[PDB]
Design a protein around this ligand. Sequence first.
Ligand code: 77V
Ligand code: 77V
Lengths: 266, 264
Amino acid sequence: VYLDRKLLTLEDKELGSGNFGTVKKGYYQMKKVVKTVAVKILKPALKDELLAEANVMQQLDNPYIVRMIGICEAESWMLVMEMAELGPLNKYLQQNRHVKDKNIIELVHQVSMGMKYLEESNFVHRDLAARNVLLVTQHYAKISDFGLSKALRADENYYKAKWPVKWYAPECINYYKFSSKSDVWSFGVLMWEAFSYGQKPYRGMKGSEVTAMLEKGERMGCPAGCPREMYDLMNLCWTYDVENRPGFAAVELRLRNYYYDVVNEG
Amino acid sequence: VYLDRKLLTLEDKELGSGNFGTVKKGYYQMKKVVKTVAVKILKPALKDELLAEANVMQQLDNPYIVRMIGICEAESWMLVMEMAELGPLNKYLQQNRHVKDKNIIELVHQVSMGMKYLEESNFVHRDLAARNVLLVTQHYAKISDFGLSKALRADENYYKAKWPVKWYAPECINYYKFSSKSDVWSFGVLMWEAFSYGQKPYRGMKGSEVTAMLEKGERMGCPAGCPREMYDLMNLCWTYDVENRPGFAAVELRLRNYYYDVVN
Ligand SMILES: Cc1n[nH]c2cc(Nc3nc(NC4CC4)c4occc4n3)ccc12
Ligand SMILES: Cc1n[nH]c2cc(Nc3nc(NC4CC4)c4occc4n3)ccc12
């Protein structure tokens, strides 16, 4: 997967930014056509981190997960990925509030599908948020940003450790253990964010304030006009006890079963 | 607006046809000379359908837009326009592969100027394609077939709905929202055809196949010998998100500057 710089064509304008560098829009002269590509460009460990993300990606093959097109060594380092034409879900739901509840369920259910694959493949996302969910169409979501993501060992159930504490489960805070159940906590916080329309979780609260709230059995409320059955599920995602918290299999099922009704019985 | 049939002389051979009727070539006793005219002749609602086309035309005065001379209520209804001596760009370019890159740029830049006028006047062409661009000279093009064109209200940015999918933008296919931004998508499809020398876009594919190809982030490739910068510009037109897509002012500004350099 070492792409040819002659085929790649960049848009001299960014759609991303970060410690890594800039993410510019591009066009890659594919098999017979031209595929629009998102391209992470390195401005060290930044090259090891980008080779990590490139490895976590090359393995994962799922519709609801950003597919990678390949690496491209040229004037700089290029991580070539399948472009999500509409952008990050938090910034998209802020701008478009006419996005009906049904459209929102369909999108979070697509995240629960991609996450269920990540679970089955033995991968921890570790940064699963509204920001890191990008849109192909208004009705097609892909899970992005695999920089904190970790491939698990065959005999291992969890990983043991920058600090997205608002998306983090209590065992990540307290004991640094991350598993697919910790991503189920993040998914809860992500599900909240969408129904809120990109409103930031635990608005104004500091990291320890969030930790203290969750230890008191306190949770974020039901965003305005969110279907009760979705808030029901958020709190289920938000179970303090890791052993009793559902897996993505059971979460995606609850989203699938709800959606199946919603479209037909509504 | 109401032409004397005493001044209108019609030929036998047609320049086109449709459900509307025939497009006979004609001559019109004008000022002190004779103007060559293209005449749309009805074969019901089609009358108020062709009156809609005559109305869009009456309002538009720009060199790169097929001027209307007037109407004629004689044998059958006649819509009298200014003759495009060489005809449709696709057929012209299919039948002329000697036409150089500098020549095609100049013609698509001319389409882009007439389109910048139309955008500024708050009209949506809705049928922009190589076939609806007619050549007056191998160096003077005109936007025609204002059949699908609509005139937006002073407060609306778009229009909400024959259906040339292969030219339509995704927001049109999905939600039926035509605007000058949707005409930029079609403009990009026009720009492709012209460098393809009249080759039909997305050959063999059905409407849904095209739609699926677009959502997959795939676009038509670079036609053979097409200046890279003109291919870079098609992809700009071919922006999925309408908000991030260039307008006609932005499209003309890129063609004007390229051509400014290319000729000089
Ligand atoms: C309006 C707007 N802002 N940003 C955008 C980013 C995109 N598309 C996109 N962006 C990536 N990286 C960027 C940091 C997000 C991607 O990475 C993998 C796929 C992918 N697709 C589209 C629109 C916007
Ligand atoms: C060789 C050849 N074939 N067709 C031609 C059409 C023209 N000129 C023309 N044609 C119109 N309508 C035609 C259906 C396209 C026009 O409508 C308004 C103006 C106008 N000027 C010239 C040559 C040819």
